[PDB]
Amino acid sequence: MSLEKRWSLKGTTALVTGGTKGIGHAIVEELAGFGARVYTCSRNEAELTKCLQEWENLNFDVAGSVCDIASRTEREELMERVSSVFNGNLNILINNAGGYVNKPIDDVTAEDFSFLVAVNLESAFHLCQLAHPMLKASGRGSIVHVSSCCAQIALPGHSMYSATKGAINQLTRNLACEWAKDNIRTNTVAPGAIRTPSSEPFVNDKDAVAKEVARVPLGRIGEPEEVAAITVFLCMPAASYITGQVICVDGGRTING
Amino acid sequence: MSLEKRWSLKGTTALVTGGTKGIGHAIVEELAGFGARVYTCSRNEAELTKCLQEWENLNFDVAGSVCDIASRTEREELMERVSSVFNGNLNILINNAGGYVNKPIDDVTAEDFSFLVAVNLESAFHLCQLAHPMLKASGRGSIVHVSSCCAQIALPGHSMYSATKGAINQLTRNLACEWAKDNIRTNTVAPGAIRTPSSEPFVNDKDAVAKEVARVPLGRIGEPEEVAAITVFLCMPAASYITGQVICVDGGRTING
Amino acid sequence: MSLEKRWSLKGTTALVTGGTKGIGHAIVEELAGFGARVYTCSRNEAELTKCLQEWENLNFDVAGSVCDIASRTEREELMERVSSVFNGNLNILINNAGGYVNKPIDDVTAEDFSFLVAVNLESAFHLCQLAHPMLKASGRGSIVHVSSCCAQIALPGHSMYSATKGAINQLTRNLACEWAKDNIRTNTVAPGAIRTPSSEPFVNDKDAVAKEVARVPLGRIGEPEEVAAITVFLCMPAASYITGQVICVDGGRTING
Amino acid sequence: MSLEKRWSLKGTTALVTGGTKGIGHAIVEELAGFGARVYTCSRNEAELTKCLQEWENLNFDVAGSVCDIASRTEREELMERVSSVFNGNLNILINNAGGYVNKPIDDVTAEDFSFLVAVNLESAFHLCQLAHPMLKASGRGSIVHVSSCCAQIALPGHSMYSATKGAINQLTRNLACEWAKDNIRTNTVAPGAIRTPSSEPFVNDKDAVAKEVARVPLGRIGEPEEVAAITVFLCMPAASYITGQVICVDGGRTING
Ligand SMILES: NC(=O)c1ccc[n+]([C@@H]2O[C@H](COP(=O)([O-])OP(=O)(O)OC[C@H]3O[C@@H](n4cnc5c(N)ncnc54)[C@H](OP(=O)(O)O)[C@@H]3O)[C@@H](O)[C@H]2O)c1
Ligand SMILES: NC(=O)c1ccc[n+]([C@@H]2O[C@H](COP(=O)([O-])OP(=O)(O)OC[C@H]3O[C@@H](n4cnc5c(N)ncnc54)[C@H](OP(=O)(O)O)[C@@H]3O)[C@@H](O)[C@H]2O)c1
Ligand SMILES: NC(=O)c1ccc[n+]([C@@H]2O[C@H](COP(=O)([O-])OP(=O)(O)OC[C@H]3O[C@@H](n4cnc5c(N)ncnc54)[C@H](OP(=O)(O)O)[C@@H]3O)[C@@H](O)[C@H]2O)c1
Ligand SMILES: NC(=O)c1ccc[n+]([C@@H]2O[C@H](COP(=O)([O-])OP(=O)(O)OC[C@H]3O[C@@H](n4cnc5c(N)ncnc54)[C@H](OP(=O)(O)O)[C@@H]3O)[C@@H](O)[C@H]2O)c1
Predict the structure, then answer these.
(1) How far is D173 from chain B (nearest CA, A)?
(2) Domain range holding B116?
(3) Cβ–Cβ contacts within 10 Å for residue C243, how many?
């Protein structure tokens, strides 16, 4: 296969959960920029409609609908709309939307626990199950979860958040092996500190980011499109021999002494 | 500190969940053999009473009560009995009891998901929270989760089971870092195929174990006391500089090509 | 930067060691396909000349000279020619050329040891040293080592080969952290079994292929351009936040139980 | 086997390279404390003689001879003496003695490279080869390398040192798999900062200590016997199912964000 084909996504369809802000927003534009048809979602109808209007002016083909992926019913309705819009053919699934709690281990409540598990673990797992017939039908499927580099080290207050992301890391390996017979590859991008609306409060704390950036060899927090780039590459045919891998996008955070 | 003291557990107290069968049963006898006072539990009153009667004849000091660690209420009652029996001083917590489901990813039900998470992840997490005041009060605390070597590789049908065990692996690192100030170390033993009542059906399938043992460099399945030995060592003062680690007890399974 | 600029190597200069066959040949053509001026080498003058002739006819700007990277003097002369050709401005360094010995541990000779160390480890380390001033001068530097997925698992007869590759994996982390101040990133691509002239004896052993393929979830040996694609991506500005990582390109080999 | 027999080295024979100071000295006394007949070595005749005199007075059966493990001829003469002393029956091989250089990557000289490779990598590999017939003859063999926790992260000035130790980590996996048929297990203990005569310049730099201690969850540098304890455990029959593992002994250093 030629270079132009191997580095292209024209004629592919993709689903990105939580694509109205930050990393997921960058992933949607990065996928559409390489010729993919993108479907996304969020919980805010006004914000989602503004983004769909913005992407239309950029000549992108992006559809979407309101969906809280922490609800089993709404995950099923979402995959039913995706299956009808894309005619049951889905090439790409990006499990981007997540949830975050920053509390010491003693302070994690029962509701904190179930919230993180529902949005970070059960949602991705169920969406993979629902996507399986469509990924197999497309002929070339690519699942990319976005996890966190703190699923390999210990950060203060990240216990249950990092634990759910660690489960996602292992789920990557099971999916890659079980669904290899369906020509479906599964990988994970694990970001470090990235400038998103969710990381804004931490970013506006001068003393907090100074502690963080000092641990980063590249000496800065990452940008959303620095995560979206590798995410998109893993979905290209050029990555046809890469499956089951956890790629850290952290500027060297986790490997730094 | 002398060699005899560093390799001893005399004068310590321990809690082992699910200590009536298999690995947990071996852990209880291994802890008691080194002079520890052991508290354990299971869901079967008759079987638990027989084990407590057996350990009494072996001159062990083992107490216990019926408890389903998948229930939040029963976990709280258990830690209240442990706190009264041990006078609020607990040195060792062994999160041994677990749950297992063997199904392809497509077949994992919503009830399969919540069952595995409750017994493998939430129970261990909550029991650590409840044990924290007593571990800090003892002056030298040791938490050991028992996970699985399949939280680092992909085995058929192990998806959600391995995913919960992967979360346990990351939780080890958070606990070791957050509670280091309380002189509490946290580690994890990750067993391979071990001869227990739970692994019996797989063990009695000649073709299935032949596939498994062929992947094991040592050419056999492990015994329960091969897991209990390292578990006990991690609780001794000799392991005083080992914390946050995931030790695989698999006969070389996961590192074998 | 825009999408077009982030996914481009236009205006860059690169060095690939061993680009006349196999993976290195795929990397050269992949780099030039994205607009990079390439310099390559090998030990065979006639073969390198034919490659340079072929690449010029494909309108690539690729230069080359004969060099045995296992020779310190020839590594210095190589980096001297690269400096004059590119005017002391080098963006990319790909350490591809290596050596291989398949013998049990009892059979590895002292000459086998020193050969594997010289070609797989010392060459890459020294070339990084000699390239450091030029990479810093470019303003945007990217080092990529080609290691092996068997640096994480044990394959029969791979002991010393995998040991040197394991040393490469660690060197990646040191290079990423020490030279991040110079705007240089360092990563590593660790391939599985790839169809190259070196692997030809392994590929023509139908029994040995079937044994290896059975352990690969994707059910096949990789192709050279499947390694070259991710190699080139790690050199693009799109990978600006990825450093110190070892990316296994093996079709799921190392994570398949 | 019973508890007493599984946690015993009575009747065993061991070899520790570099047992006159620091970690190796702790390993010798720890092995003999459990009943093992030990053989050790160093490059200083007077110091080794005093150690042998001290160990005899403590009623240990420890023998020794002068040997520079960086010399192939002296490694062969060493293993020749070990064979006659133990009558060709060797249970345990501890590769403790090593070398260290702290320089930035730009400053590592060709002599620094070859020195680190010879003492940290080639010595251990060759000694394993020479010990293989004796370990197989013992009927129960155990190899333990002493690597470093910095073979998983990047510390300033550790590049080549950590690279050789990273090679040791991989060699552990090959040795465990190739020699499992001979009833030989191979594992690795990877220490953090330990109070040894070698680390004395680092320990007497109050600024350098505080910088390192701040990254250690346990908030202190380790002690030699904290490394020796787990080293001895991996040689006991109790560890019969543990092989091919790298156990970090660093107080949580490598997993602390
Ligand atoms: N520093 C970092 O940013 C960082 C570091 C490590 C890992 N990560 C991971 O990277 C991923 C991206 O995170 P982010 O930083 O972009 O912030 P985020 O809050 O995880 O992403 C927010 C986007 O997802 C949507 N969303 C949130 N919860 C949702 C739900 N339950 N159902 C449907 N949509 C939902 C949001 O829209 P609405 O709020 O309107 O629903 C918004 O469009 C996350 O999974 C996170 O765990 C981020
Ligand atoms: N091959 C293997 O055996 C293997 C491999 C990898 C990992 N592991 C892990 O090693 C650990 C030990 O497992 P195992 O093989 O000994 O079998 P297991 O079924 O996990 O352990 C059973 C013991 O725990 C008790 N138990 C089970 N569920 C419980 C609950 N909800 N509440 C309280 N007690 C409970 C059982 O008593 P009752 O049933 O009477 O309650 C029994 O005493 C598990 O966590 C498992 O995940 C085992
Ligand atoms: N299955 C696989 O192919 C596989 C698997 C894992 C890792 N790898 C790694 O991936 C890399 C690519 O290997 P490959 O299979 O492409 O090898 P290959 O097909 O034999 O290619 C070797 C290339 O490097 C050149 N070369 C070899 N030794 C050299 C030296 N001392 N100095 C200068 N040039 C030299 C060769 O040219 P001359 O021979 O004319 O000098 C040739 O152009 C290697 O580092 C290998 O260790 C490969
Ligand atoms: N902070 C740490 O201490 C630390 C951290 C990470 C890893 N490590 C590793 O742990 C191991 C223990 O190091 P250590 O700190 O105990 O070193 P040390 O205190 O300097 O002990 C060195 C011992 O080995 C002997 N020795 C050194 N070079 C030798 C050679 N070429 N041939 C024969 N014997 C030799 C020495 O005796 P002579 O000098 O009289 O020959 C001495 O008995 C080393 O492999 C080291 O790389 C240590």
Answers:
(1) 6
(2) 1-257
(3) 31
